Each structure stands twice: as C-alpha cells, then as structure tokens.
C-alpha cells in the first residue's frame, strides 16, 4: 500500500494497487530524431 511507501527502496521495483482517477493525453516523445546544423549544413542522428 502507498501508506507503506518510503524513501527506503527508492528506484527499486515496487508492487502497489489503487484506483486510476485519470488518464490525461497521449503526449508525443521522440525515439529517433534527425538533426541538421542551420549553419554547418551538417547532419547527425540521435536515438533514445
């Protein structure tokens, strides 16, 4: 239960339960982006 969450085990895996109130919006994040320098006319790519 959330009542027993602690600063102990921060960033361990945790198992907990409740009710979902709300679900917001499907925001958009990258996973590949291709990039050019506006002055060097020079290209790279980044992945996450």
């Amino acid at each position: 239960p959330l009542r027993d969450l602690d600063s102990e085990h921060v960033s361990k895996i945790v198992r907990l339960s409740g009710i979902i109130i709300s679900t917001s919006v499907l925001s958009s994040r990258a996973t590949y982006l291709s990039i050019m320098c506006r002055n060097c006319r020079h290209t790279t790519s980044i992945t996450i």
Partner: protein
C-alpha cells in the same frame, strides 16, 4: 528534421489509495504515474489495478520544502482485476 524522425506515445496516470480503506481524518494521497508505448490506453479510469513499477524521483516547479523532490512511478507493466464493472 521532423519529417525524418520517429516518435512514441506516453501517458500520465494518477493512482490513489482506495477510498474503502484510508484514514478517517483526511483525504487520500495519490501518485503521479506514467507509461509508454503499448502500455498506453490499456486502462480506463475507475478500474482496479496492481502496478509493477520503478518508484522514482523528479523535481517539480512548485507554487513544498527547503529542498525536496516529488515521487513518481514509471510503469514497466500492469495488470488488473479481470474487468472492472
């Protein structure tokens, strides 16, 4: 270069302690919860769930204490009572 880039969907959820079992003296507390890719849209508000997650820490642009952080969970998977209501 947006037209040669690939993107993904993520979502913000909030979970609160079930009002059936909380302190008589005050409101329930809750956690900001996030999920990515195919884990999105699997869940409907008001369903009963167990989350397996990384209890993690972020900084909030508050306006809270003299130096502090806010907890959040990155969901790395989810399951439920077989279908709520």
């Amino acid at each position: 270069i947006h037209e040669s880039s690939k993107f993904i969907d993520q979502q913000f959820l909030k979970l609160q302690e079930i009002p059936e079992l909380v302190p008589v003296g005050e409101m329930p507390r809750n956690l900001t919860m996030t999920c990515d890719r195919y884990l999105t849209n699997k869940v409907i508000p008001g369903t009963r769930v167990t989350i397996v997650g990384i209890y993690s820490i972020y900084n909030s642009k508050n306006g809270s204490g003299v130096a502090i952080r806010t907890p959040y969970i990155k969901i790395l998977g989810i399951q439920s009572d077989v279908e709520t209501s």
